[PDB]
Amino acid sequence: SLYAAIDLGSNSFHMLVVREVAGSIQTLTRIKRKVRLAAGLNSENALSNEAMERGWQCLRLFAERLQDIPPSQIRVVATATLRLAVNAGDFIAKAQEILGCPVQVISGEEEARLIYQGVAHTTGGADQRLVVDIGGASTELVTGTGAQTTSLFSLSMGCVTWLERYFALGQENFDAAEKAAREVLRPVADELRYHGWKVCVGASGTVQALQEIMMAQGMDERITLEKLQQLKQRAIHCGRTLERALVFPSGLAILIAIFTELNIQCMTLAGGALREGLVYGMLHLAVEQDIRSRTLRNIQRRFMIDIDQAQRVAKVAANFFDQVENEWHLEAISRDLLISACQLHEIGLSVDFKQAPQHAAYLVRNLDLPGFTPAQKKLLATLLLNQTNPVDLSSLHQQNAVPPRVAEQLCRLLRLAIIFASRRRDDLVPEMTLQANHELLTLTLPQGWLTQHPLGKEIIAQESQWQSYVHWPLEVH
Amino acid sequence: SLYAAIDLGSNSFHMLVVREVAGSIQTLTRIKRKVRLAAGLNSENALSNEAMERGWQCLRLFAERLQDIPPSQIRVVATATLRLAVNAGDFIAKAQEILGCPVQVISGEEEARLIYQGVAHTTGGADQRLVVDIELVTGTGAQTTSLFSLSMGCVTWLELGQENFDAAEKAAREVLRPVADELRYHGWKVCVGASGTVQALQEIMMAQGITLEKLQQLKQRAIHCGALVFPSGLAILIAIFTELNIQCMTLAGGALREGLVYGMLHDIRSRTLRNIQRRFMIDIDQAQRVAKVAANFFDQVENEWHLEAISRDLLISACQLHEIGLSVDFKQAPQHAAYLVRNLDLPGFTPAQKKLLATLLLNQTNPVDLSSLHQQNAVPPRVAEQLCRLLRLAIIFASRRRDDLVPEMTLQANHELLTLTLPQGWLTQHPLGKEIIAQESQWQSYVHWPLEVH
Amino acid sequence: SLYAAIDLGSNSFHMLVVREVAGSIQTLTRIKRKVRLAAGLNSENALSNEAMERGWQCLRLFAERLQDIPPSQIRVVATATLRLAVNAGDFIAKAQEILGCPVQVISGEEEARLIYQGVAHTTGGADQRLVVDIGGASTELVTGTGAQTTSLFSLSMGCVTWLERYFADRNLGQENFDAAEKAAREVLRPVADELRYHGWKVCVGASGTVQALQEIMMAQGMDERITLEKLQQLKQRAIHCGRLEELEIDGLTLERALVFPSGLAILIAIFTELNIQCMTLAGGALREGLVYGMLHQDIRSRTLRNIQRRFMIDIDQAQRVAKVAANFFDQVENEWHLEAISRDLLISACQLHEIGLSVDFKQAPQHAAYLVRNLDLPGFTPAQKKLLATLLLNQTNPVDLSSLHQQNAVPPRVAEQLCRLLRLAIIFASRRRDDLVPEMTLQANHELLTLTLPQGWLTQHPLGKEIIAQESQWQSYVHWPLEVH
Amino acid sequence: SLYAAIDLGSNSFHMLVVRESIQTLTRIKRKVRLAAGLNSENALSNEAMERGWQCLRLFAERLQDIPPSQIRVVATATLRLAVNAGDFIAKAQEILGCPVQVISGEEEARLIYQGVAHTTGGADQRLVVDIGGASTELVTGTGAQTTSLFSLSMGCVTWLERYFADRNLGQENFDAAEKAAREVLRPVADELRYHGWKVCVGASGTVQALQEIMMAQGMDERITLEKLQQLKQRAIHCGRLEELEIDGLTLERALVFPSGLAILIAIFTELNIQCMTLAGGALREGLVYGMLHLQDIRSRTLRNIQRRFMIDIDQAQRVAKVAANFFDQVENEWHLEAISRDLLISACQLHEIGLSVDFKQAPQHAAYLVRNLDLPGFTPAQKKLLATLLLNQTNPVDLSSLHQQNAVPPRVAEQLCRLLRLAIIFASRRRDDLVPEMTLQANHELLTLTLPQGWLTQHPLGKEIIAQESQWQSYVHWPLEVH
Ligand SMILES: [Cl-]
Ligand SMILES: [Cl-]
Ligand SMILES: [Cl-]
Ligand SMILES: [Cl-]
Ligand SMILES: [Cl-]
Ligand SMILES: [Cl-]
Ligand SMILES: [Cl-]
Ligand SMILES: [Cl-]
């Protein structure tokens, strides 16, 4: 059965259809039609006939998409413009006759709660987080732990209104909007660093925008203060994406104000926003301790991945990681990437046994993996591509999620792990010592294990050979 | 659960591990190890001990790969070489302690029986069929009517100017001339080949872009030249062809080891199709919904377009899988769909047929790529287009996912013109539909498919 | 003007046509036609008029290709099969007049001498070398230094003869291998002392068996270095297949496979008797030998210079950048444990790094790689050629590790290090004047480079500063830490 | 040696550095904003004064080792106006080791015409349109002597302000600009139209947006007002300005694209312009060729390239000889006009370029070189077809690439390709005295070639190569008979 969320906003009407798969949800259609509803709104604070007719025609099309979707599974909501129209009930009234179902105007705060609920369902990392959505109407800031909102503030700052207001681009023109936006940030520095966060995550177009310029210029996806300073000092350089660009400097001035005010170290892009909030709310899902686990679990059902074999390889790889962790100085996100790889590593077998690593990497590049950044997906995919056969460093280093040396190391851990869990018995997995000395791995097998496992011996000899072609010394006794 | 078939042959030991998932089985490993058992015979019909050592060493590896498989789901068998050895009992004895389980020596007829069961459970096409292994068999629907072992084999004939070819050919036609009689009586709708040799030939068929025409024209790719076993196997078959008056040969999707697996288990196409839907969580009501529309469309245009019942079933198959790309992701679903179909093993469809499903699926929407429709051998180019059209339009009018919301339509074909008639007023009441149908119209026309809809 | 070389061989007639461009050679046509002349030999060693007909007909084509080239600039040679056939004098005379020129039967020794000349003009590395060429009927071993042979031998063993004696019954077992190797050691043994006396710094090989090895190793993902270990692994593989007709080795083509076991056996026997540590594939052979003699020390440098001439590369800029690169290498060669091979490859990159400019400035790295990838570069192996190309592809802009690492020639970490030196070296030659290159020190601390500039040099050059800053960013996106003040 | 050219604009400073025929080494644009130092009384402020100076010290570090004799600097736009400008120009002159001169807009337009005149192919009798962001230059001329010259007041940036005070491509704000610009050049209009031109070429941003839009959308390369208004209609249908998108348009382009789209179609109408190719040079190129003190471009290009890649020139003429003769014998039957004769000869002069890389896959190398080389006197479309002819000079034909070009119709790309293969083959002996006498006759898709009596029988390798060439053509349905 189908679920739908419609967001009637300022410039565009957004409709996201979606479908229930096992205990999951996948996008079916995701649609945006440019109504220009805030443009038809005059100095009497009412909305011109032309804009309400534009908006209504759009919804006549959306209405065609909702037929025999039970309205229990639909939620339509509206935002700033329809919040502040003196007209609004005239539009909403016909809107609800066109669609077969209610329109709910929502407070700027209920938009924030919804947005949070949307990143919370779609974002990996720590439960304690601080969400930043810089929109044109309101720039919300919310703190929370695992789907409970501790603080929730919808503050009135636009990328449009900090734009027109303070830009008719100086190094000091940001300066105005900066302190301007900092005045609103001045009271809540108290309560936002009160509850704090261990991870910071952005949600909307200006955030999305910055993500895409970093991607474009060759940086990773970590938004740091020093990277926005490449811009601000190059942002009086020009001095005065197409649509994104126009509204960019104000949003950028707001972000460079928020990083400095709150001493946010790092921001990365949420995988969720309002429309996901609405449609996850309708799912009635117990909220998970770790989102990535739900994702992996659902993919495993969908593609009938053998879970016991999956779990067995994760255990071996986790054990190997822990034993080389100090010598290789691996951090924890690498461990979760490695395990996540192991949970998915046989998905290529869904398609066919022969070229399964090719199939694995195809599926993982292209699957929607909530809880995983785009950069992390590619890393997982290329790890899966290199799970066996001659190492292909060319395709391995097609990732930017972890440092290259570390990509190689997680590759090595995954390849070995698959080999020593390969018998598909939880009692056939031997006791082993793994010791790393710089680029050397030494694996100590149970005495007599090799001479007693002639297929194991063959496979480890081959693996040693392959790692050596790529100058990874492997010694297994 | 996981099942294994092992075939102890003369030259090689073969293994097949298979997993039973949803409505069928999928291959896990398919392994061949060269033990050269036959080479260790001394003319006293005894096996060298070095040969026994090789075979036991190969089994030691197989046996490691088979732990967590229970003996009742394994079948190990042994072909002619261990049939003729006074030694055999000694090898088989250590082998059964190495493996977890018994080794069953089997007669050639029984091997031909099991082989045939293997082609039966894995091969699309009709029921009655004539199998050729360079051992020939006829049967209908998993029941072997006739059976054979003839006086030719792979290596046997070898020991290319037209002399040396027809030195094999007519001497092969000699071998099969007296036995070719009782065959035509039993009859065959479909002629198939199971041996690897046949696969020498299928690789060329879908490599250049099985008939006696292409056989002689291949035999003349040989004559003009002036691989170990190939020229023998060729001369036999094109002799097996003429003397049996056989129209065309396809390749079976199974052999001995498939026979052993299915014999342990409690329309091939239908099984595959539903198997795939299960595995990739395709919405089966929607697939059926699209198929009834497309088949209904098909029926209305098939008289004008001269369409074969065979084309009908390719079209319906395409509709059964058309949403498989969505199991990956919605954005570029047509391309994931072509990817999955291209790489799945699909029992009941030839390589040309699978290649045609893929491109039908890739072109189920968006700007049409005619070249893509064209690189495929299951159907003429024009037919691939005709069925692509029906599939794209069937998908549009079923996009609601509800049986009673798909409109009553009539479809008329005048050469390349399709004329779709919707219920009166339908277009008026469906603004998004209007929009989709105009965009499809625009797309069909970029590629010279003229489409009126009323 | 044109030069041409005909090799009338046992299985094939080979032609090479060639042109003197700049100060080196450029190949125009390279032609092999199978006449299978030895196939028309008989038990009495006379050539079937069938075979002899195929031969003349080929030479009739070689002839038309040959017209309007002076006989001064042509050499036609016949080898083992035509020095066998009693019949042979008859094929020559007609062939000699089907072509416009003489057909010279050569001894196995003159065959050896031209082979060594072929390799010495095309092969980089230590110029004091051992050359092995295992042919059908004979095996040349020549010992030499930089075009001067110090010892030379043509011995009666070869893949075709050895397949017949020791692989009598078509079995690939340890029995027949042991015999084949034992006989070859006994052929070779008497000349071993003279070969070791003159010694060699590098062993390089030449014919089908060596080529089969390059193609096998390439296919299986190994480097291009032939070692005893790899030969033993192939041998155990051959023994596993057990019958010549069942030989299957990944990388081993059909027509190499027929003569592969016997050659493999001879080469292992050669590898053992002389204790060869490593054998690589020579740049050239008999037909190169024929050509370089009609033309009348460091192969790499001749190649680099000739390419610079052909593509109008600025040679002063090239040397400038190479000097900066070579000196960066030395300051860091310690901490990064870098060998002499790397230094040469780094410098060679520097000599060619600007060759993409000869196409156009916008995409010049992309063009440089295309040119280097596809150019013939005598003195460089295909693995080295591909490395150079990829250092050039990455000489500027955001580092692309994916393209950097499709390279087999150095170890992966060394490919990066060399790349980093090439990028910096280029940056500090950017103004194209030897006087304008600062005094610098570069210390390497594991993955981090520290570069110290003359006092306030950064403050004085707002461009150099700007670029350097960009290069430290580029390096940082790949996690190469670079400090410059 | 190396030459430099610096252009001091109100918006940006522009460098062009070149090695000597000549080739670009660096092409630089720095952002200055000298228009924002000009106040109400029209003197230049000391904020931007330092900015352009800070920019000039970067250009300065680049231009050492270039003697000032081989440098040329000019200042335009904002620098004329400002009464303060002399102050700037003075310290700028100290920063660079060389003089800066202030040039007018009409001298600006002469150096512009000089730029296209030395670089651009096609009829030496031309109309040049260049739309700055503020000033629009239009110049009639015949072959490096200019018949007429104009610099008007309209530009992308200006028309984005005055006649575009929002983001609505609705015809009301659009056609006010298509008028107020059309009346701007309506006074000068008549003197251009009677001076006349055989060809119209353009050189500003607006014109590069169209060349790019056209190669991306697969159209042929002549810009028409009909083509201009498929983009007007896929502009108009785009509602607001920020929402604008078409195939082949880029970041900085669409920024001011619509305001220039109006100006070009206004120039297209009032002047009644039939089509437009993209000019090969401009102001900075003018400056550069003024320092070189140097007949027809293409032949100058072909020589230069043949020298860089050491192409055997004799063999190149020898092949172009045969292909010329083959062209003339099929010329009437096949609808072959001189434009596409030159293209055949140009392909021949270069046909051996890939051999400068390596002989094995030379055709593939020749296409790569020609595809990426800068070839003054050939449009992008013509270059692209030259590449594919060279790719297909031998070896099984590939039609897709032969039909991948904007230059000459998919039909003729083949007929040309056919004649090149034939000319190469019979020139293949590298000697004048060995080319055989030949007749070549076409009838629809049949070529029939008569070699001397007994030639074939007595050229087995020829006979073999010819046979293989008959098969390759037939594969692609090109019937060929030869006797
Ligand atoms: Cl794979
Ligand atoms: Cl990486
Ligand atoms: Cl077997
Ligand atoms: Cl029948
Ligand atoms: Cl030595
Ligand atoms: Cl290796
Ligand atoms: Cl050595
Ligand atoms: Cl003038």
Tab-separated table of C-alpha atoms in Angstrom, chain C residues 43-207:
chain	number	residue	atom	x	y	z
C	43	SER	CA	61.328	-36.561	-44.079
C	44	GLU	CA	64.094	-36.053	-46.644
C	45	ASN	CA	64.105	-32.275	-45.847
C	46	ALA	CA	62.849	-30.995	-49.192
C	47	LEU	CA	60.268	-28.245	-49.539
C	48	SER	CA	56.914	-29.191	-50.987
C	49	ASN	CA	56.158	-27.132	-54.052
C	50	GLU	CA	52.973	-26.445	-52.063
C	51	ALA	CA	55.002	-24.697	-49.341
C	52	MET	CA	57.413	-23.117	-51.809
C	53	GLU	CA	54.396	-21.752	-53.685
C	54	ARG	CA	52.950	-20.133	-50.553
C	55	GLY	CA	56.361	-18.555	-49.907
C	56	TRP	CA	56.830	-17.004	-53.336
C	57	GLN	CA	53.267	-15.721	-53.363
C	58	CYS	CA	53.930	-13.879	-50.087
C	59	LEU	CA	57.212	-12.484	-51.375
C	60	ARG	CA	55.288	-11.288	-54.418
C	61	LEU	CA	53.297	-9.064	-52.034
C	62	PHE	CA	56.324	-8.019	-49.976
C	63	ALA	CA	57.765	-7.096	-53.370
C	64	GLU	CA	55.002	-4.646	-54.353
C	65	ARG	CA	55.350	-3.096	-50.879
C	66	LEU	CA	59.088	-2.877	-51.501
C	67	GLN	CA	59.104	-1.019	-54.804
C	68	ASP	CA	60.715	2.434	-54.896
C	69	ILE	CA	62.884	1.579	-51.877
C	70	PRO	CA	66.622	1.332	-52.747
C	71	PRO	CA	68.190	-2.126	-52.277
C	72	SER	CA	70.846	-0.339	-50.195
C	73	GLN	CA	68.247	0.196	-47.493
C	74	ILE	CA	66.797	-3.359	-47.527
C	75	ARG	CA	67.913	-6.620	-45.870
C	76	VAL	CA	66.177	-9.978	-46.471
C	77	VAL	CA	67.312	-12.940	-44.339
C	78	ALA	CA	66.454	-16.642	-44.119
C	79	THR	CA	66.926	-18.719	-40.989
C	80	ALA	CA	66.837	-22.300	-39.647
C	81	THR	CA	64.263	-23.836	-42.030
C	82	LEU	CA	65.952	-22.534	-45.181
C	83	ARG	CA	69.384	-23.507	-43.896
C	84	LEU	CA	67.932	-27.014	-43.524
C	85	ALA	CA	66.135	-27.875	-46.755
C	86	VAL	CA	68.322	-29.530	-49.370
C	87	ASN	CA	65.742	-28.027	-51.688
C	88	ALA	CA	66.470	-24.565	-50.288
C	89	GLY	CA	68.653	-23.198	-53.091
C	90	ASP	CA	65.632	-23.438	-55.417
C	91	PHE	CA	63.221	-21.348	-53.321
C	92	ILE	CA	65.850	-18.635	-52.851
C	93	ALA	CA	66.665	-18.077	-56.505
C	94	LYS	CA	63.066	-17.428	-57.565
C	95	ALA	CA	62.343	-15.500	-54.346
C	96	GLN	CA	65.547	-13.559	-54.985
C	97	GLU	CA	64.087	-12.426	-58.294
C	98	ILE	CA	60.484	-12.088	-57.090
C	99	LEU	CA	61.968	-9.473	-54.745
C	100	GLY	CA	64.512	-7.113	-56.235
C	101	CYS	CA	67.381	-8.072	-53.999
C	102	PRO	CA	69.406	-10.802	-52.255
C	103	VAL	CA	68.077	-13.343	-49.758
C	104	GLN	CA	70.901	-14.168	-47.294
C	105	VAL	CA	70.808	-17.410	-45.312
C	106	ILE	CA	72.297	-16.650	-41.912
C	107	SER	CA	73.867	-18.937	-39.369
C	108	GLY	CA	72.426	-19.313	-35.901
C	109	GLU	CA	75.403	-17.190	-34.841
C	110	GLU	CA	74.639	-14.327	-37.238
C	111	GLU	CA	71.043	-14.756	-36.107
C	112	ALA	CA	72.313	-14.298	-32.533
C	113	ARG	CA	74.310	-11.197	-33.407
C	114	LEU	CA	71.354	-9.388	-34.979
C	115	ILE	CA	69.160	-10.316	-32.012
C	116	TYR	CA	71.610	-8.709	-29.585
C	117	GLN	CA	71.828	-5.638	-31.839
C	118	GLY	CA	68.024	-5.502	-31.794
C	119	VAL	CA	67.793	-5.588	-28.049
C	120	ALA	CA	70.703	-3.210	-27.439
C	121	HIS	CA	69.107	-0.353	-29.366
C	122	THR	CA	65.659	-0.810	-27.801
C	123	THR	CA	66.269	-1.938	-24.218
C	124	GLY	CA	66.806	0.255	-21.176
C	125	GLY	CA	68.418	-0.710	-17.899
C	126	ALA	CA	71.961	-1.766	-17.151
C	127	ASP	CA	73.685	-1.965	-20.482
C	128	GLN	CA	75.692	-5.050	-19.370
C	129	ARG	CA	73.207	-7.746	-20.146
C	130	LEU	CA	72.440	-11.415	-20.833
C	131	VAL	CA	70.055	-12.051	-23.765
C	132	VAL	CA	68.160	-15.327	-24.162
C	133	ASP	CA	66.195	-16.227	-27.266
C	134	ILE	CA	64.559	-19.636	-27.307
C	135	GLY	CA	63.590	-20.450	-30.886
C	136	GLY	CA	62.040	-23.428	-32.560
C	137	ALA	CA	65.257	-25.358	-33.147
C	138	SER	CA	67.917	-23.258	-31.411
C	139	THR	CA	68.499	-21.110	-28.334
C	140	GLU	CA	70.717	-18.040	-28.598
C	141	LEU	CA	72.548	-16.859	-25.471
C	142	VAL	CA	74.509	-13.644	-25.923
C	143	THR	CA	76.359	-11.675	-23.311
C	144	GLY	CA	77.119	-8.085	-23.992
C	145	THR	CA	77.607	-4.496	-22.961
C	146	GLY	CA	75.868	-1.660	-24.768
C	147	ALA	CA	76.099	-2.957	-28.362
C	148	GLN	CA	79.477	-4.747	-27.780
C	149	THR	CA	79.007	-8.521	-27.479
C	150	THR	CA	81.429	-10.198	-25.091
C	151	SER	CA	80.218	-13.780	-25.742
C	152	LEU	CA	77.795	-15.441	-28.147
C	153	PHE	CA	76.342	-18.928	-28.581
C	154	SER	CA	73.743	-20.695	-30.747
C	155	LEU	CA	72.835	-24.041	-29.151
C	156	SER	CA	70.710	-26.927	-30.519
C	157	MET	CA	67.648	-26.890	-28.282
C	158	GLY	CA	64.313	-25.283	-28.958
C	159	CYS	CA	60.656	-25.622	-28.194
C	160	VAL	CA	59.852	-27.551	-31.338
C	161	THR	CA	62.690	-30.108	-31.057
C	162	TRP	CA	62.301	-30.384	-27.259
C	163	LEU	CA	58.572	-31.043	-27.571
C	164	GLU	CA	59.402	-33.979	-29.829
C	165	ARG	CA	62.096	-35.709	-27.768
C	166	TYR	CA	60.979	-35.160	-24.190
C	167	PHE	CA	57.230	-34.754	-24.620
C	168	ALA	CA	57.151	-37.866	-26.746
C	169	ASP	CA	53.874	-39.342	-25.508
C	170	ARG	CA	52.095	-35.925	-25.178
C	171	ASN	CA	52.105	-36.046	-21.336
C	172	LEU	CA	52.721	-32.913	-19.251
C	173	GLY	CA	53.809	-34.851	-16.193
C	174	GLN	CA	56.807	-34.433	-13.933
C	175	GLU	CA	58.471	-37.316	-15.789
C	176	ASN	CA	58.767	-35.525	-19.134
C	177	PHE	CA	59.526	-32.128	-17.616
C	178	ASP	CA	62.436	-33.578	-15.637
C	179	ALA	CA	63.853	-35.097	-18.862
C	180	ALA	CA	63.365	-31.904	-20.913
C	181	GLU	CA	65.012	-29.699	-18.287
C	182	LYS	CA	67.819	-32.227	-17.757
C	183	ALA	CA	68.739	-32.230	-21.452
C	184	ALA	CA	68.687	-28.430	-21.697
C	185	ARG	CA	71.004	-28.062	-18.728
C	186	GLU	CA	73.274	-30.520	-20.533
C	187	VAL	CA	73.132	-28.488	-23.768
C	188	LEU	CA	73.786	-25.261	-21.880
C	189	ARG	CA	76.271	-26.498	-19.217
C	190	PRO	CA	79.505	-26.350	-21.316
C	191	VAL	CA	79.079	-22.658	-22.204
C	192	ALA	CA	77.915	-21.698	-18.721
C	193	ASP	CA	81.415	-20.771	-17.486
C	194	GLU	CA	82.008	-18.349	-20.388
C	195	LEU	CA	78.597	-16.752	-19.796
C	196	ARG	CA	79.195	-16.245	-16.056
C	197	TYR	CA	82.773	-15.065	-16.674
C	198	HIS	CA	81.581	-12.020	-18.587
C	199	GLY	CA	78.582	-11.811	-16.241
C	200	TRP	CA	75.562	-9.574	-16.550
C	201	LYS	CA	73.796	-6.945	-14.516
C	202	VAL	CA	70.463	-7.569	-16.297
C	203	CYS	CA	68.913	-10.566	-18.054
C	204	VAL	CA	66.479	-9.837	-20.863
C	205	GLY	CA	64.717	-12.304	-23.167
C	206	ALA	CA	63.296	-12.330	-26.591
C	207	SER	CA	61.169	-14.933	-28.348
